Design a protein around this nucleic acid. Structure first.
Lengths: 38, 145, 148, 140, 68, 190, 102
RNA sequence: AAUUCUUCUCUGCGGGAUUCCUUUGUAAUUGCACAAGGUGAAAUUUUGGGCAACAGCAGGUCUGUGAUGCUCCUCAAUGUUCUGGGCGACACGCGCACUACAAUGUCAGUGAGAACAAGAAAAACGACAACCUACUUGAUCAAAAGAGUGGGGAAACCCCGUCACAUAGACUCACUUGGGACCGAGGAUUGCAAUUAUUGGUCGCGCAACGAGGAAUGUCUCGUAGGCGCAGCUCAUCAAACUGUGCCGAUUACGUCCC
């Protein structure tokens, strides 16, 4: 489990829903359609 | 005008009145090994005594009211804290084990089988005496004991 | 009603308090509350016992003979303590001082022979996990490391 | 000759079915009024019937569908479906006066049914533990 | 007996550092054909108080906060 | 009234009741109720606590120290047993005894710090109606856990034993012993 | 062949901007359509600690989605559905649907 | 098995709440407002959050990142290795933070029995199904296991414990029919490999503390604390962690500035 945007295989990566976005964080990587509410 | 449970309070009644009817009647089936615990995470001996003696009509009143079930669904009635659990939070799980044998008993003796519930449903009739015949000094009315 | 006697009753080489329940007092004999549905297959039929029947109404002398070599009585192997053994075939029981004499033979090899958790275990620190330390509040003695 | 109504507490939903007859007794969610096990709920679920008109008003055949709460909130879900359930009738099948007598006698009784008394558990939040309880400080 | 049961006429104010006790003017509750009022003796009450409270005074005829 | 208006604990008499002490009389709950377990927004507001039956208030105040506790329904069981023991001990409506056991329980007067800024100083301070209500039930049932902790041969009786006594004013009750011993810290200080 | 429509898209005024509008291509025309309501809404909720680092006020994000499903039902036009869906061009991220059953 | 429906559920967009009457109320010719009360599901930023200025802190991160300045390394390398093995986790009861267990007769321990909940997840390509779960066999003989069938791409699921039970159940002035720690023997399991991975797995150790906690210290006020429990996240295997859902449901203040 190296992950998508980086070599990482660290900054433990969300498996949740199989989107693997943590490499460059799901904060930096966005437009996924997530929003900040609550 | 009498239905399964529902007229009865089968909590300790519609079971127990069936129990004597299961035990005193030689008809039914009790497998060999009772030395083993029926129920989730219990180191206490399976009971004081009369182990299947709580078990069977559950499965019947389990069958009856809940219609289709099985080995997997019926232990939902077998309850436990699952708490022996050692220095951790306790958690909760049911018993698949004696299930098969338990429900084989009704696979004999006039109660339907590898799919459904029952044949004749004695439960009403053989239970139809509860409001008639009380154990506890059942009050009923001044007419019935 | 009539209780001719109550006492202590030495069952297997052990002082067993007379307790108004038989299995729970049979507990001291290195059998355990699981092993006291044996009280049925230790060939007593009496129920919810009082100190009215050991020897007297158990003919007890046999019962404590069952807690040893139980295969001669009707018992599964799933309940036997030593089940298949490294020196010989099973002694269907751990009971009385036969337990620790075999411990003093067994208690060398693992605690001799190294482990992480097992040598933790060998020094009895901690069960399953990486906590050794603030483990142990409310008292004195837990775990202890001396190489000086 | 019928109405229908719904009880609610927290998540617990009671639904009051309605059928008519003047001789009759009510099942619990699934089981008659008399035989519901925790006494101390029964006499409550008696209050719908007993208090206000015990007998003069309603023996009506009634069944209730209660899902969505734990045991006691399902005992409060129920009775409301009844008091709601009963008040439904005397508006549809009876005069304002017979209604106006009843719902007043409820109003004085308490909010037996004015409403679900809406209270729902607070969402857990942040690093806050459960709700409003904070992860605790040290070496402060 | 010692029970002499007065009314709070009013909350004469909050008094004290913590938020607890509250100055109150008390109207002795007992009424007789020779009506014995104080008429009013100021008191300090322990815990929450309210406009028509019945305040039975076990130590009567003490002149309250005065000093501090 | 054919069990329409009138109320029953299961079957019990809530009508003939009143408080004895004109001090906290006429604000304390005079019961019409069946079960002490009711759910409403109990105290949204400031003095709302004085409305509901002490029967609740006790049953409500009934089980502090929660460990695996069921509270109201577990409480009501205990109050099934508690009242019954009491009336056919005391030959009265235990609704009275309990009502009579609230008043004699709490101190009419207290002694607090009025001292300013770390100074521990005294004043005689005069207790308020809701504090004889409140502290009674609070300490009243505090006697339970104490009398009830280990040495019990006594399952529910502990609660019966400090309601009986207080209703007798006796100085043995953990209830009343603080009503006096606080006033040894009251009339002494003043 | 009574057909079925599952429109799954997130964004504002898409799930609406087809089914509401764009079935009136069939709705008010020669087709006869069975509208139900949209199925329930989902939220896909991930929560990640805001700190790239270790240090924090122990703070967390909660990020969410909403996925909006609409079911819309038919009798059987033959080849019209191929024309039906193709009438109307307007949306994005919205979902095309090919379904048979019963 | 035929009928009609929208009470219950589904959801996009809307209604609703506003200081609106009342109190000669508090205060006050103005004003801005406050209170006790009314109506109402809701009654005073309705409720819980998200957001959030301007200045700063040599706050943390060069272990998130082809995000980056130096300047150390550059091939028996500080690079890389499905590279091999070991550590990161060790036992001086060391000192400290947070959590889980709990010792009772208030479930109290346990054996059975009755009811009922909710947010949430579930899957595979450059090959010819690897995720869950229901049923029933494993069952002429433990438990957890093994295996075969069955649909779900998610509105495939709803029997969670707390509690209720007097079921006339068993305990019974005690470190104990309550600690589950330490413990050696078998055995099933995920998988390259478990020498404690782990466990409704058995069953031995119980005689290891332990018996309301010294000063000192924590955080909140209404569906709240507390208690209970369930999924999720990590995850081949493992939750005393966190994230969220729901059930049981409290006493105390509706205050002050003393700390």
């Amino acid at each position: 489990r190296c992950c998508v945007i980086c070599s990482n295989q660290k900054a433990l990566i969300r498996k949740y829903e199989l989107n693997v976005c943590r490499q460059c964080f799901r904060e930096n990587a966005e437009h996924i359609g997530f929003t900040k509410l609550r | 005008k009498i239905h399964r449970i529902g007229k009865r309070k089968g909590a300790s009644l519609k079971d127990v009145s069936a129990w004597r009817w299961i035990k005193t009647a030689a008809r039914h089936f009790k497998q060999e090994g009772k030395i083993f615990v029926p129920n989730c995470t219990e180191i206490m001996k399976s009971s004081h005594g009369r182990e299947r003696a709580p078990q069977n009509p559950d499965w019947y009143y389990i069958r009856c009211a809940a219609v289709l079930r099985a080995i997997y669904l019926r232990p939902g009635v077998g309850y436990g804290g699952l708490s022996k659990r050692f220095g951790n939070k306790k958690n909760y799980g049911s018993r698949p084990e004696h299930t098969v044998t338990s429900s084989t008993g009704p696979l004999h003796w006039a109660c339907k089988s590898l799919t459904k519930l029952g044949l004749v449903e004695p439960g009403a009739q053989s239970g139809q005496r509860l409001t008639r015949k009380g154990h506890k000094f059942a009050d009923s009315l001044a007419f019935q004991v | 009603i009539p209780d001719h006697f109550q006492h202590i009753v030495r069952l297997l080489n052990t002082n067993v308090e007379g307790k108004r329940k038989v299995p729970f007092a049979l507990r001291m004999v290195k059998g355990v509350g699981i092993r006291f549905a044996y009280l049925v297959c230790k060939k007593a039929g009496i129920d919810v016992e009082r100190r009215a029947g050991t020897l007297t109404a158990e003919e007890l002398e046999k019962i404590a003979e069952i807690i040893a070599d139980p295969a001669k009585f009707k018992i599964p192997d799933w309940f036997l303590n030593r089940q298949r053994d490294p020196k010989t075939g099973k002694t269907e029981h751990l009971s009385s001082s036969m337990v620790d004499t075999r411990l003093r033979e067994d208690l060398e090899r693992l605690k001799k022979i190294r482990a992480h958790r097992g040598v933790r275990h060998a020094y009895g620190l901690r069960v399953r996990g990486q906590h050794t330390c603030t483990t142990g509040r409310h008292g004195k003695t837990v775990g202890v490391s001396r190489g000086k | 000759k019928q109405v229908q109504t719904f009880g609610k507490k927290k998540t617990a939903i009671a639904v009051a079915t309605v059928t008519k007859a003047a001789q009759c007794n009510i099942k619990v969610n699934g089981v008659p009024l008399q035989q519901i096990l925790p006494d101390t709920l029964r006499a409550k679920i008696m209050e719908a019937i007993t208090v206000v008109g015990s007998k003069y008003y309603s023996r009506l055949r009634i069944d209730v569908a209660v899902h969505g709460g734990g045991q006691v909130s399902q005992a409060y879900a129920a009775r409301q479906a009844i008091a709601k359930g009963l008040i439904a009738f005397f508006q549809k099948y009876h005069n304002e006066v017979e209604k106006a007598a009843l719902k007043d006698k409820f109003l004085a009784y308490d909010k037996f049914l004015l409403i679900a008394d809406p209270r729902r558990c607070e969402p857990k939040k942040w690093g806050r533990h459960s709700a409003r309880t904070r992860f605790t400080k040290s070496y402060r | 007996d010692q029970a002499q049961v007065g009314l709070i006429i009013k909350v004469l104010g909050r008094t004290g550092s913590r938020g607890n006790v509250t100055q109150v003017r008390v109207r002795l509750m007992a009424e007789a054909g020779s009506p014995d009022y104080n008429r009013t003796i100021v008191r300090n009450v322990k815990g929450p108080c309210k406009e028509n409270d019945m305040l039975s005074l076990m130590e009567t005829e003490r002149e309250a906060r005065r000093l501090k | 009234m054919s069990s329409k208006t009138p109320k029953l604990f299961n079957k019990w008499s809530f009508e003939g009741l009143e408080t004895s002490e004109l001090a906290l009389r006429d604000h304390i709950s005079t019961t019409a109720a069946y079960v002490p377990h009711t759910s409403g927004r109990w105290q949204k507001r400031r003095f709302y606590k004085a409305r509901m039956p002490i029967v609740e208030r006790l049953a409500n105040g009934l089980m502090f120290k929660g460990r695996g506790n069921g509270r109201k329904l577990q409480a009501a069981r205990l109050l099934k047993h508690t009242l019954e023991i009491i009336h056919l001990l005391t030959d009265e409506n235990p609704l009275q005894v309990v009502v009579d056991a609230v008043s004699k329980g709490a101190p009419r007067e207290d002694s607090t710090r009025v001292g300013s800024g770390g100074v521990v100083r005294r004043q005689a301070v005069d207790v308020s109606p809701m504090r004889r209500v409140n502290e009674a039930i609070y300490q009243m049932c505090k006697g339970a856990r104490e009398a009830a902790f280990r040495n019990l041969k006594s399952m529910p009786e502990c609660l019966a034993d400090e309601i009986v006594n207080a209703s007798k004013g006796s100085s043995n009750s953990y209830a009343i012993k603080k009503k006096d011993e606080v006033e040894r810290v009251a009339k002494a200080n003043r | 062949q009574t057909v079925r429509l599952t429109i799954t898209s997130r964004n504002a005024k898409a799930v609406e901007s087809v089914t509401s509008q764009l079935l009136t291509r069939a709705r008010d025309e020669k087709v006869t359509i069975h509208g139900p309501v949209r199925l329930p809404t989902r939220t896909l909720k991930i929560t990640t600690r805001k700190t790239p680092c270790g240090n924090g006020t122990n703070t967390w994000d909660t990020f969410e989605l909403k996925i909006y499903k609409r079911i819309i039902d038919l009798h059987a036009p033959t080849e019209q559905v191929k024309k039906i869906t193709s009438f109307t061009m307007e949306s994005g991220v919205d979902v095309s649907i090919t379904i048979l059953d019963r």
